[PDB]
Design a protein around this ligand. Structure first.
Ligand SMILES: [Cu+2]
Ligand SMILES: [Cu+2]
Ligand SMILES: [Cu+2]
Ligand SMILES: [Cu+2]
Ligand SMILES: [Cu+2]
Ligand SMILES: [Cu+2]
Lengths: 116, 116, 116, 116
């Protein structure tokens, strides 16, 4: 993968399992175009979103559907989503990991960029 | 001020001054109606977005735009568009503080909800 | 108050009330001398730890103890001992705010340094 | 590994490479006893700190030497360390990952516990 998402749950101290993730890419008309989506695995990871050939230079939006996650567990959270926007491949091809840490009233997101 | 926004820069341990903030409210037809807007002061806060008379039950979006903040540091390239969507006053009136913590590859946001 | 502590609970999106805070200052012999202590108020803040006359250049430790906070929620088991160590006023006097964000398996802390 | 540490740099959007990590275990006399230490790899990970047989029930302290890290890069940070305290194996044997996100004025730490 050049693009991985990883989601952690701060309440339970576990990976967030089975969370919906939607990735969008900013188009020429200046809207968000759907790019990929998936659900996190037992380990809280989502691999296989794209190929290197399909993950070109651009602006991407990762949208994690955290409200459904917290409601599945009986908790009414604050946010609808955890979002993060990043700019890809301005200097060509790279591994990208979007790490997200969730709690009912707070979250953080991080983009890690690695040249293998 | 039942609604307040505070923005901080985690590299420089400073308030983020002149961050544009826009707030929207979901209408009956499911479009986003404009609700309030402002800039963060010297202490990174924005108060006076609304009154309790106008801040009714609903679904609200707060968008922060950090462009002016970065530009004036002489960091033109990186800047942030961040958004939270939440449900307000569903169990009666509350004071909301939306706090955001910025960094070049990471973003955190937290919400503090009290009852006076 | 050139030194302030703010504690927030990220599960409940609330201030943490009655958190004991202790502050220490490194002495000439490299032992930690007691400097100040207090409890967080209703809004999760502690002010009045010191004056600018007493808050001189030095290396300071701030310890937060969340036991009373958890106990009163009926969460006895989990509680936190957290500590930050930092250098204060090295380039002249500054106001410091040490903010902490608690959760069962995660902890965040941030420092905001301004110059009045 | 039943114990891994993972450190990320929020400024550069990379793993934190070559950071010193010290792990302590709380002893019977109620002091911190040294348990293990190591440096993060190219990927920001430290594996091999212990065996399952040696990582028994107890209270552990992970101390990341972040000040040296930031100074290596030319930045005068706020904190001396990123710390985290956790309780291990109260319910027997588990994989533990201590994830840390660093910036010069803020950090977060998370303990992830997984039953393989
Ligand atoms: Cu959605
Ligand atoms: Cu309408
Ligand atoms: Cu813009
Ligand atoms: Cu002395
Ligand atoms: Cu204690
Ligand atoms: Cu050390």
């Amino acid at each position: 993968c050049p693009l991985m998402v990883k989601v952690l749950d701060a309440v339970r101290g576990s990976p967030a399992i089975n969370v919906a993730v939607h990735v969008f890419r900013k188009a020429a008309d200046d809207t968000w175009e759907p790019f990929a989506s998936g659900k996190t695995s037992e380990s809280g990871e989502l691999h296989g979103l794209t190929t290197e050939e399909e993950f070109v230079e651009g602006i991407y939006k990762v949208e994690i559907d955290t409200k459904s996650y917290w409601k599945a567990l009986g908790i009414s959270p604050f946010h609808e989503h955890a979002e993060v926007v990043f700019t890809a491949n301005d200097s060509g091809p790279r591994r990208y990991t979007i790490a997200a840490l969730l709690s009912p009233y707070s979250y953080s997101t991080t983009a890690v960029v690695t040249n293998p």
